Design an enzyme around this catalytic site. Structure first.
Site, PDB file in Angstrom:
ATOM      1  N   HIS A 305       0.815  -1.219   0.000  1.00  0.00           N
ATOM      2  CA  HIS A 305       0.000   0.000   0.000  1.00  0.00           C
ATOM      3  C   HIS A 305       0.848   1.267   0.000  1.00  0.00           C
ATOM      4  CE1 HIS A 305      -4.225   1.594   1.148  1.00  0.00           C
ATOM      5  NE2 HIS A 305      -3.596   2.431   0.342  1.00  0.00           N
ATOM      6  N   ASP A 362      -7.592  -5.751   2.390  1.00  0.00           N
ATOM      7  CA  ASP A 362      -8.275  -6.293   1.225  1.00  0.00           C
ATOM      8  C   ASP A 362      -7.934  -7.761   1.012  1.00  0.00           C
ATOM      9  OD1 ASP A 362      -9.803  -4.064   0.384  1.00  0.00           O
ATOM     10  OD2 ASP A 362      -7.918  -3.071  -0.178  1.00  0.00           O
TER      11      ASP A 362
END
Ligand SMILES: CC(C)(COP(=O)(O)OP(=O)(O)OC[C@H]1O[C@@H](n2cnc3c(N)ncnc32)[C@H](O)[C@@H]1OP(=O)(O)O)[C@@H](O)C(=O)NCCC(=O)NCCSCC(=O)O
Ligand SMILES: CC(C)(COP(=O)(O)OP(=O)(O)OC[C@H]1O[C@@H](n2cnc3c(N)ncnc32)[C@H](O)[C@@H]1OP(=O)(O)O)[C@@H](O)C(=O)NCCC(=O)NCCSCC(=O)O
Ligand SMILES: CC(C)(COP(=O)(O)OP(=O)(O)OC[C@H]1O[C@@H](n2cnc3c(N)ncnc32)[C@H](O)[C@@H]1OP(=O)(O)O)[C@@H](O)C(=O)NCCC(=O)NCCSCC(=O)O
Lengths: 426, 426, 142
Positions: A305, A362
């Site tokens: 990320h 996720d």
């Protein structure tokens, strides 16, 4: 105020610029009126320009810190629920049983979608991608619910805000049902936000649906964990789209299309292929995608990320739930234990340790979802459905700041005036 | 090109920054390096910030300059047709003959919209604003063109654009035919781009509609003067979204809703009809209806303009065209006397003269369309239709850049990490 | 022989020979042809059927589907015994199959349906219903 007193923009005459300070995180230099003094900055990337002032969510990258209205995402994702959270982001404080019970009333009593919009669903092809259909619909909302579009009448803004909150679940589950040929299900007031959405996704007229206690909670948690993520690209679209006056729904559609954005290429899902397409310890990984991944083929399955430095403050709890979830279903998981092996890879595989391709929410959400019997083409849809209150709170914010109209400047590097002569025809 | 050497800033430490220059315009300061130095500028609205570098359109608001690839608008309007302008606007240079044919023949090749898409219009209510149907059909094309939704691929953009460019008018016409209850009209490969529109706008299967070259040139021009307009709310929305991954169709559907936001605002709303409602050659003449002016919403009615100071360059060819067509549509104009009036009241009144509410390009465009029996609801649609060639360009040019995407920084001022403990139990 | 038939005949003439048992005269051929041309259009209701399939389905499954469904639109002549029943029934198939065939392709690619044209030939009429649009005059290349 650490190593910054009063700065000086130096042209030929010293220009002192007052440095402002946020309650958390870096303070900033002011530059609003610079234009009013012919002085403009150049930053195609807005990585040094502070678009706005906010109070909803705070994220400290390096620290892996994420707070919503001051509360640590951890506490919220564990002791609250999407609605209370929803109430919070939108209202800045946690509700009283009375504020919360009233809120919960107004929400559930609008979860029904106009029947004409159902007719709209059938116009769309059966092979369409949920996300795609999802946009197709949201965007068409401004053509029916035409009274809550007065973006500058606080009387009409909370209307849409509530409408978008009550209806997104209804719509998303209609994207699923539709893609699989089952009849659409109606809301259930006598159900929690997540339990109803679970119901609407999976119930069939053939028999009543039983909402598993652990699944109901695990879903809510996913909702809570995606409610908002500060000023990302999607919120920047919802903020920028809304600054020009666009009606509520129009912006949300944008935040949905944008959210989908970084995922549409020949190897965007082609990677997110051997993730569910193949379920077996030694096949997907086992000397396979060690080099089988080609363009992104990383940042799409739930690894890494650009906001957080070392980990995902949201993954923390999401993981705790996979346990409870896989465990629970049992006859709906153990095969799906090619996760620990994937997870593992990331943790120790040099290619990963070097790429900071650590597992994120996720990934754990993917697992939980790929477990509830939810297809991957419905993951983002569910992530967007949740990010909506976040989008809604941001837009209502920017409209409190006086509808910050995003009309940047440009640096012109094209032809100077030149006469126009055309000898052609047609 | 003097002090463009460099500069410096410092509150506690100094940083060497350069001063960039354009082929036209002002001087910018590349703060592209301060982000790292832990320095951030605060500028809501990009009020003193240059978001990008563009070689597309140049405006000099204070001196009424409008260049599309260097070519003034005026010349383009009188000396070119819409398509030739799309090419110039899309390619960067005047089209040869063989090159133009390629461009045109293609556009003509894919004008029809998928039959399935057509079934969509049919799922809206006839009584909805044709502008909401436009943002709806367009924000829904993605689900019918699944393949090319990947912004990265260079040919993806290639095709995707042409689709928009080609089908937007077809879609535009259809909305009007749906709104008034008449059947849909398929594109005709013989007619011109503009003629082809008026054809799909007004013909029926009952009588051979003949296009009046006069009325056509007007649309042709109405179109050109709307092809593109440098950076602004709608264009900025488009760029942003596109940069945020999102597919071109969504990008265009988001732009289209940005060019409708001012129309629906309330004070504007009560003022939009305000004009388009009371005109009995007793009211306007003695500034009756014009005796009321609290809620202005002038530019929405074609008065003044945010960028231009004294006049809108795009307003000349249109004022002359406006006259011509009136002379052409012969004596059928009576109500459009207030037309002759409003201009007179906008040039001879102090207030207006002082608040510079000068008839802009839309004042006359409206008069023409009206003179053409086109309903107001169709105004922003035709504009958005013509403007799409511009949105593709900026969108395109935003990609071909490098697009390190964009995560604007916020100056957080909300609460400070506090503990949560729900005051509710429901 | 087939070879001769292929080079020296047109499809319809072959249908007749194949259906009647002998080469058609001139007046007999006209009767045969004019009839086939008379009933090429398929019932509007039938048309609504195509529209109940997904565009993404194999045009061959739509063919077995539309055809295995004509019975419900031609209730009357479903009695194999009657000699004229066969008489009509056939001509219906023979006449409408191409119309139906074209349509499946137009549905598959998303383009509008194209009605049969009584001037074109059997074969030309096909390529016509296969490729023309309401946007440009399609010319058949002999
Ligand atoms: C302008 C509005 C009043 C209507 O907007 P709308 O989108 O056209 O209506 P909608 O699509 O949300 O449908 C809601 C209607 O169906 C009813 N309804 C929807 N879902 C359900 C359900 N699950 N069970 C029972 N009734 C339902 C709901 O009660 C409402 O009826 P009413 O006319 O009394 O408000 C709008 O403000 C609204 O209804 N909700 C937005 C939030 C808001 O501010 N609501 C007003 C207070 S509602 C008080 C309460 O019931 O607690
Ligand atoms: C990529 C495309 C060629 C096709 O994409 P599309 O969205 O399916 O176009 P579409 O859906 O409107 O057209 C589908 C069919 O309808 C046809 N069609 C659509 N509108 C019309 C019309 N007004 N008149 C005649 N035919 C039409 C179109 O020609 C095609 O038929 P076919 O395959 O037999 O030629 C087009 O979108 C395009 O503009 N391409 C240019 C960009 C590119 O790189 N193209 C590659 C080939 S070069 C294209 C050219 O020179 O024409
Ligand atoms: C029995 C039929 C005449 C009628 O059956 P059908 O299935 O209803 O044909 P259909 O549904 O395509 O046609 C219905 C109507 O549409 C008309 N029609 C259909 N396609 C076309 C076309 N392409 N052009 C013009 N008219 C058409 C058809 O002529 C009839 O109109 P009308 O009654 O005014 O002449 C026909 O199926 C057939 O082929 N009959 C031959 C066998 C027989 O024994 N016929 C008895 C009469 S002799 C027939 C002849 O010589 O034409």
């Amino acid at each position: 105020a650490d190593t910054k007193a009063k700065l000086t923009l130096d042209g030929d005459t010293a220009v002192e610029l007052d440095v402002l300070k946020g309650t958390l995180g870096q303070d900033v230099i002011d530059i609003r009126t610079l234009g009013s003094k012919g002085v403009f900055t150049f930053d195609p990337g807005f990585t040094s320009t502070t678009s706005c002032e906010s109070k909803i969510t705070f994220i400290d990258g390096d620290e892996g810190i994420l707070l919503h209205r001051g509360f640590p995402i951890d506490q919220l994702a564990t002791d609250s629920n999407y609605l209370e959270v929803c109430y919070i982001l939108l209202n800045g404080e946690k509700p009283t049983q009375e504020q919360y019970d009233e809120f919960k009333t107004t929400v559930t009593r609008h979860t029904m979608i106009h029947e004409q919009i159902t007719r709209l669903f059938h116009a769309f092809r059966r092979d369409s991608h949920p996300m795609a259909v999802m946009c197709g619909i949201t965007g068409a909302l401004a053509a029916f619910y035409h009274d809550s579009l007065d973006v500058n009448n606080p009387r009409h803004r909370e209307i849409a805000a509530f409408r978008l909150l009550s209806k997104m679940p209804t719509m998303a589950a209609m994207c699923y049902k539709y893609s699989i040929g089952q009849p659409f299900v109606y809301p259930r007031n006598d159900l929690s936000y997540a339990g109803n959405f679970l119901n609407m996704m999976f119930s069939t007229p053939c028999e009543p649906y039983e909402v598993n206690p652990i699944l109901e909670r695990a879903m809510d948690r996913i909702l809570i964990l995606h409610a908002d993520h500060e000023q990302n690209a999607s919120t920047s679209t919802v903020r920028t789209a809304g600054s020009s006056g666009a009606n509520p729904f129009a912006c949300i559609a944008a935040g949905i299309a944008s959210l989908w954005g970084p995922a549409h290429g020949g190897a965007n899902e082609a990677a997110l292929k051997m993730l569910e397409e193949i379920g077996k310890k030694e096949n997907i990984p086992e000397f396979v995608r060690r080099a089988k991944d080609k363009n992104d083929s990383f940042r799409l399955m739930g690894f890494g990320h650009r906001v957080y430095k070392n980990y995902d403050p949201r993954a923390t709890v999401m993981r705790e739930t996979c346990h409870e979830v896989l465990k629970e279903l049992g006859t709906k998981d153990d095969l799906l234990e090619v996760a620990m092996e994937l997870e593992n890879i990331a943790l120790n595989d040099p290619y990963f340790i070097e790429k900071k391709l650590y597992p994120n929410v996720d990934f754990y959400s993917g697992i939980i979802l790929k477990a509830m019997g939810i297809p991957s083409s419905m993951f983002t849809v569910i992530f967007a459905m949740a990010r909506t209150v976040g989008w809604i709170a941001h837009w209502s914010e920017m409209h409190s700041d006086g509808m910050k109209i995003a009309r940047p400047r440009q640096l012109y590097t094209g032809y100077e005036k030149r006469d126009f002569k055309s000898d052609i025809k047609r």
